[PDB]
Amino acid sequence: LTRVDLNSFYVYCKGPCQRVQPGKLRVQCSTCRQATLTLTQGPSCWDDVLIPNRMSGECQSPHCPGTSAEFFFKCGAHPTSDKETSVALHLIATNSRNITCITCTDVRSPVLVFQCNSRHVICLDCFHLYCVTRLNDRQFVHDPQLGYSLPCVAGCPNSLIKELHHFRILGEEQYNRYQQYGAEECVLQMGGVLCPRPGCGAGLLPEPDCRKVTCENGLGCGFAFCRECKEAYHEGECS
Amino acid sequence: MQIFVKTLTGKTITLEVEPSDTIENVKAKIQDKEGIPPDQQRLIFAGKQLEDGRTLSDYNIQKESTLHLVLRLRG
Amino acid sequence: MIVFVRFNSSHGFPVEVDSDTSIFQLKEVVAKRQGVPADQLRVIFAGKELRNDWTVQNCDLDQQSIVHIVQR
Ligand SMILES: [Zn+2]
Ligand SMILES: [Zn+2]
Ligand SMILES: [Zn+2]
Ligand SMILES: [Zn+2]
Ligand SMILES: [Zn+2]
Ligand SMILES: [Zn+2]
């Protein structure tokens, strides 16, 4: 697993690195969650390690009939425990061939490879700014299947980042803001409403027909408002 | 592992979960803490609505990460 | 360097090895610690059993990584 170069892979280390780091591919047994399973064959693509249960083996634990392999990643920047895992940022690759950043044209490493047809390559600096600026301007795209993402910076079709942990490049505070905005957008995409009472903003999913929306045990602020004008609930037409 | 469920008001609930716990499990836990019936709960991670059948590991939801909780109003 | 040894899901204790230490040598010290024969021990690391003749560095064992060792 270690010698596989599907050019090291990169994780987001939440601690103590708090950054994108070269990762280690490892594997446990998907049944007893112990790193005793031996792989039948090694993974050849990302799908082999990312798709659950895709690869098989034999858990060498005495009382375990585990056959399915569960791949996990660890930060390679320091010793990690057996369960001290990190999310794989599979779009990030060592820029071994010195591909120039689609945006700033500089050669940096590593880089993010957009899954557009052109496999557009962006340095992490530009990706960070691309993310920060698009976030602040509410330019992140909501996809009902994928979530709150960004396409290729070139704007290539069918290029929305699927692994949304890539937006870990936003740093902690902006990442949480991203998650917040995404959830808000999701609510609005599902035809819901954000509670308009100041210091609230609770995501609400009322009946599509309902005009009366009550921000109802400790979650809502109790404000009963009109869906349309967002003022205190009223009979008849708005204003 | 410890995860956080936050309403869009920033109201935060801590959950003890396993990466193998289903979204339906998460909701049951949310109900256990706050008393929100699971049918009213919609969990969102990074803008994607989490499906009851899937697990946290299905979404690569890490230790100390945050799910967003919004409410399905039925009244 | 140090290698962590998880012996049948037991808490990983450290084993100081050398770059050229064989897997069997590692099996020995573990066997001495666990009071078991070294022949009934298998060394699982990175989804592959490590063969007795392989050296620590050969197996791409990084400093303070973990190897599982099971029995029979
Ligand atoms: Zn790290
Ligand atoms: Zn097992
Ligand atoms: Zn750049
Ligand atoms: Zn592109
Ligand atoms: Zn409210
Ligand atoms: Zn109105």
A75/A116 same-domain check: no
Q: Is the peptide bond before A110 cis (omega within 30 degrees of 0)?
A: yes
Contact C27/C43 with Cβ under 8 angstroms? yes
Instruction: Name the DSSP class of A14.
Output: T
Cα torsion A98, A104, A108, A110: sign:
negative
Show the domains of chain C with their CATH numbers. 1-72 (3.10.20.90)
Resolution in A: 2.6
Last residue of a domain, one of A93, A121, A154: A93
Q: Which of C37, C44, C51 is nearest to C4 (CA)?
A: C44
Q: In whole angstroms, give the CA distance from residue A168 to residue A135.
A: 13
Q: Which residues on chain C are in Cβ contact (under 8 Å) with A33? A: none
Helices (H) and strands (E) in chain B, counts: 1, 5
Query: Given an 8 Å threshold on Cβ–Cβ distance, is A204 in contact with B71?
Result: yes
Mutate to test the interface with B, among A32, A169, A179 (most CBs of B within 10 A): A179
**CA–CA separation, B26 vs A202, rounded Å?**
19
- Nearest ligand to the C-alpha of residue A223? 5
Pairing of strands A141-143, A147-149: antiparallel
Contacts of A130 (CB under 8 A, 6+ apart): A103, A122, A150, A153
Question: What is the distance between the alpha carbons of residues C28 and C58, in angstroms, rounded to a whole number?
Answer: 18
| Residue A30, number of CB atoms within 10 A of its CB | 21
For residue A144, give every residue at least 6 positions away whose Cβ sits within 8 Å of its Cβ, in sequence order, or none: A189, B49
Report the C-alpha gap between A91 and A115 in whole angstroms.
8
Contact B6, B67 (CB under 8 A): yes
A191 lies within 8 A of chain B by CB: no
Q: What token pair was written down for C62? A: 């990084």
Technique employed here was: X-ray
CA distance B32 to B11: 16
| Integer Cα distance of C37 and C25 in angstroms | 12
Question: What is the CB neighbour count within 10 angstroms for residue A105?
Answer: 9
A3 within some domain: no
Q: Which of B50, C16, C50, B70 is nearest to A206 (CA)?
A: B70
A45 in Cβ contact with A37 (< 8 Å): no
> Does the annotation place A195 within a ligand binding site?
yes
Residues 13-52 of C with CB under 8 A from A: 42, 44, 46-49
Chain A, residues 62-121, CB within 8 A of chain B, namely 85-88
A63 shares a domain with A20: yes
- Domain end point (choices A169, A189, A209): A189
Q: CB-CB: which of A183, A204, A219 is closest to B47? A: A183
Q: Parallel, antiparallel, or unpaired: how do β-strands B66-72 and A141-143 relate?
A: unpaired
Question: Angle at CA A168, nearest 5°, toward A167 and A174?
Answer: 85
The rounded Å distance from CA A237 to ligand 6 centre is 6
Separation CA A8–CA A2 (nearest Å): 9
* DSSP 3-state of A170: helix
Token pair belonging to B62 = 């890490």
| Shortest Cα–Cα distance, C53 to chain A (Å) | 18
Same-domain status, A116 and A177: yes
Question: In angstroms, how far is CA A64 from the centroid of its own chain?
Answer: 32
Domain residue spans of chain B: 1-75
A205 and chain B in contact, CB less than 8 A:
yes
Q: Show Cβ contacts of residue A148 under 8 Å, excluding neighbours closer than 6 positions.
A: A140, A141, A142, A164, A178, A181, A182, A183, A185, A186, B46, B47, B48
Confirm whether A1 is domain-assigned.
no
Please state, in angstroms and rounded to a whole number, the distance separating the CA atoms of residues A22 and A76.
5
Contact, C47 vs A1, CB < 8 A? yes
Q: Domain count of chain A?
A: 3
Cis peptide preceding A16, ω within 30 of 0: yes
Burial class for A189, CB neighbours closer than 10 Å (0-12, 13-18, 19+): middle
Please check whether residue C66 is in contact with residue A82, taking contact to mean a CB–CB distance below 8 angstroms.
yes
Domain of residue A26 covers 9-93
Residues with CB under 5 A from ligand 3 (ion): A 101, 103-104, 123, 126
- The reply to whether A89 and A13 lie within a common domain is yes
CA A175 to mean position of chain CA atoms: 10
Q: Identify which of A9, A175, A147, A4 has the alpha carbon closest to the alpha carbon of residue A90.
A: A9
The answer to whether position A158 is within a domain reads yes
How far is residue A126's CA from residue A104's CA, in Å, rounded to a whole number?
7
Report d(CA C49, CA C40) in Å as an integer: 13
Dist. CA A39–CA A23, nearest whole Å: 19
Fold adopted by B1-75: Ubiquitin-like (UB roll) (3.10.20)
DSSP tag of A123:
E
Chain C contact probe: residue of A82, A83, A85 with most C CBs at under 10 A: A82
